[PDB]
Structures are given as structure tokens and as C-alpha cells.
Copies of this chain bind each other. A is one copy, B any other.
């Protein structure tokens, strides 16, 4: 209404939209005010209007710690109060509906620290401080920076709209505009909460990113089983209880692991609750800065943050605080930790603090790879995540994919137009023993320049037409004369030996050749089922694909055969398994030269044919 639509139209000089899970969103406007200290936050005398109401919104910078005597850096960053003169409530459905979208890009998006220098400072802290007894865990930050096109609050609004749609689950999602600065974020964590004397801190313990299909009751339980990461958790709770004990004299009470569910990720949470009577101003001052964004112990964390960060923190790890009164006049506080948040200028310069929480068991690269990762929430709001090539197109991913093709055949990756010896012009018969690999052998013999016809085992052919015959692969046991297909292969092979026709036999056919020449066939203890093996093929090492269940087996590297003559045997000498024969008019192979698993198959077939055909 008049506030929201005067906010959006630009006639509100100073404002905030804050959206909370208590679905409505809160809109505020008033005087921007820069108090001298927390003591001087502009708070009226307590009164009861009869309605709940908000008195001011406050941004507490990390500097403010001087108030407690703790060492800091001066960012020039002041204490900021926005009186809530006006406060209206929207419905998020219609509010999102209005959106003045703009080029919400970010020029020169670079880090303060950068991965080489940041890893050094982090290492120094893990080894010189944590490892030295300075403290149990610590939060160390760098700033990502970038420059905004055209600029103005109209841009902060757009980023707020996108944050509202996707990061559904954060504690506060907001845009806050002073005159001299803007803030946009979606913070997951509350700082402190005060309702009728009762104070609440609320640290987040863990995060369960749901897998591809959906969040199961078993995936969540698996995640919750694994209790092998009890580290920071308990130092943080102790440190939180310490903080509560200074604020609530009677103590704190933890209520623990509660599950916080969101569209994509589930958090684990603890609440810590206690009774206090202290002024809000004292509550903030003494509660300056949740252990989860500083360290434990707090003072020492402060000391190490000062003795290892080159910069100030501006408002990173600080507090956005909504101070008010219930309808009965009792004091109220709702407050959120300022992380996952951009601080912007009129000048147009955006800064986002990102921290890493360091324990002794944490190593620097692993967490630096979380510097960019945790930044995904905001990063996907200065230029959304789908406009740009997928990670499948990063040159490294491309390289790794390509490396996969290194061991294997390169013929099949080549386009037709991967054609090119004395073989060019010659003609070959392939006798098909009923294996679909034959078309593949044929395509390869073709590429060497052979015109390559295929018949079946029972066909009548004129051998005189062909320069070579190839006896092919097929199913079955080569010792099984009972199968007429196998019997006919014996006949073929006896004939080709008799006539001295050059030939090449392969898998089954090669086994049958062995049996004919009198080398025994056996069956492997374990069948080969598409393995590449490096073998010694007659003096040259070759990597070839095996699919055989059966194999010829001999102790002999060579033999004279009665009718035939001298046959060279290539075999694994450890097992006697025969890989290839070379005879006077022929050559043979147990392996599939044509498999995707073979290297230089076309050449292997080439060499075999060439040898079979040499005898002229």
C-alpha cells in the first residue's frame, strides 16, 4: 500500500523491507540516525499502545566491539539507527509480483584475499593460533567485491526479489537502505531474540543438502547417524552458554538438534533460552558477536581476527536489530546476524564478506573451495546461475572427458572419411559364423582399402574371386562338432589349408584352426568379457580386446605341422594361452581387432592379411 508502493516508486528516502519466518513481509521507513554509542540508541520511555509495534531498526558494525574493550579495525563503520516512523505489512505473493528488474550484474567480481594469499593467512591461523592454544575455533573472512551497472535502490530491490523466490528458508531476507549505504541479504541465523523477558540464541549446527530425486527419511537419518563431526559444535555451544550466563543470571538451557527444513537443504539447529531483565542496549553490547561468526573464546577470537586480517569487517558478523514493544508495553527484540549479505554504496560498489570456520582438523584448500561455494546464495543474485555455459563446458571438464578415450580404439571415433599399403585394390571374403561383430570387421577391412563381401557358412562361393578369406567370429564351443555350423567351419578351414588359399581366422574360427593344427582347446576358469589386455604379438606389444570363454593352450612357441609347415605361435608364456598364429599361408587371432577395446585394430588386421598374402 502507501508505504510499499511509495517504497517501490522511490518517494521513500530511507527504508527497509524485511521478510521473516514467524507469509507476510515488513516495510519500514523513518529518520536515519547515527548514534554515538549503543548507550545512546534513541529509545523512548516505555509505553503501551495496545498493539505490538517496532521502535527502531539498528545496524551494528563489527567495530562496535571497542565498547567491550576488544581489539578491532576502524572501517570508519558507524552505528546506524532507523526510527520506524512508518510500518506496514505486505503479502509476499503480491509484493514479489511487483519487481522493477534491472541489469543486476557486477563488474570486476574479485576477492579482497584471493586463493593464493588467503590460503597463507588461513594456514597461519590454523597452525600458529589454533594449534598454539590461542583458541578452539575461529572465523576468518575475506570480501568479494564488484561494481554495479546504472546503480540505485531500484537495483537492490531486484536482488531482493530473486532472494525471496529461491532461498526460501533463511531467518531474515531483507533490503535496508540508509542514505549513504544499502544492505541486501538472506541470513540463515538469528542473533538474539527477546520476548517477555525471555532471551533466545539459535546456532546452526549442520546442513544436509538433499540428493537428486528427493529428501528421504533414510537420507536424513543416514546424515544424522554419522556423528563423526562433533568438533566445532560443542565449543560453540559452550561459548554460547557462556554468553547467555552473563545475560541471564540463572543460566541457559539448550534444546537441541531441531530440524529446520527448506526446499533444497535441511539445517540442524539448537536453541538456547534464558530469562533476563537487562536493557536491550546492554543485551546487544554484551552479546557482541555470536561465537559462530567470531570464535571461541570470544576475546581471543577477537585477538586472532585482529592479528591475521589485513582489513576491517564493516558490518560482516554484526547485527541487524529490530527493537520494539509488545501490545502490553513489554520489550521486544528480533535480531539477525549479518552474514550472506551485500553492503552497497550510492557510488555503486558492492562488498560481501564470506567467512570460513576453522578448527584444528580443518585444512586450508578444502575450506577455500567453500569460500566460493557458500557464496552461491548471493552470487546467483548478481547475475543468475543459468545465463552462462554449464560446468560441463569448463575446459578442464572437457579435458578430463577426452582423457577417457585415451586407452581405446580410435577408428570408431573417426568420421566416415577415416579411410587410409599393398592391400588397396584387393578383395576379401568374410565367412560369418553368426556374430554381429562381422559388420565391424568388415568396416575395418574396408577402410584399409579391401572390397569386403560377406557370405554365410553354408554358401557356395568361388574362392578364385578373392585375395583373402576371413573366417569369422561366432558363438559356441569350438570342440563341438555336433553343431553343424561348427562342423562346416572345420571344413572351410581344412579346405583353405589344403588349397593354400591365403586366409585369416578370428575368435571361434581361430580356435577351430588351433584344434585342426593339433593344439589343445580348453575353457578358462574365468571368461574374458570385454577386457583390454597388453599382449606380445610377434615382437610388438599391442593392447587388444578379449571376449573369449575358451582358448587354445600350448607350451610351444613354434611348431612344424605335418601337411602345413611351420606355424609361429604367439601366447602368454605364464599360462600357455594362445593369442595368435602365423603360418605360411595364413594368420589368426583370438582377440577382436575390431572392438572398441583394441588399439590400432585396422593396422593389426592389415598386418595379419599382409602376412597371409605374402607367399607370392
Contacts and interface: CB of A to CB of B under 8 A. Distances in A.
A434 to B, nearest CB: 9
Interface stretch (A247-255, A481-489, A559-567): A247-255
A369 B208 CA distance: 19
A241 B265 CA distance: 40
The number of times this chain is found in the oligomer is 2
B391 A220 contact: yes
Highest count of chain B CB atoms <10 Å: which of A136, A390, A530, A545 = A530
A136 B547 contact: yes
Given A238-B597, A256-B405, A475-B300, A166 B397 contact: no
A423 B207 CA distance: 44
Interface in A534-581: 545, 547, 549-550
Looking at chain A's contact residues, is the secondary structure mostly helix, strand, loop, or mixed?
mixed
B596 A131 contact: no
A440 B530 contact: no
A377 B215 CA distance: 10
A259 B136 contact: no
Given A413-B256, A439-B245, A530-B235, A212 B263 contact: yes
A530 B166 contact: no
A518 interface: no
Contacts of A250: 416, 443
Contacts of A11: none
Interface of A: 130-133, 135-137, 166-167, 207-218, 220-221, 223-225, 227, 230-231, 234-235, 237-238, 241-243, 245-246, 249-266, 268, 275, 297-298, 300, 359-360, 369-370, 373, 376-377, 380, 384-385, 390-392, 394, 396-397, 400-405, 407-408, 412-416, 436-437, 439-440, 443, 475, 523, 526-527, 529-530, 532, 545, 547, 549-550, 595-597
B412 A254 contact: yes
Nearest to A239: B436
Contact of A224 (B131, B211, B241, B403): B403
* From A214, A245, A369, A549, residue with most partner B Cβ within 10 Å: A214
Nearest to A383: B214
Contacts of A415: 253
A250 B443 CA distance: 7
Contacts of A547: 136
Contacts of A530: 136, 231, 234-235, 238
A527 B216 contact: no
A245 B391 contact: no
A251 B242 CA distance: 74
A212 B265 contact: yes
A167 B298 CA distance: 45
A251 B214 contact: no
Contacts of A259: 390-392, 397, 401
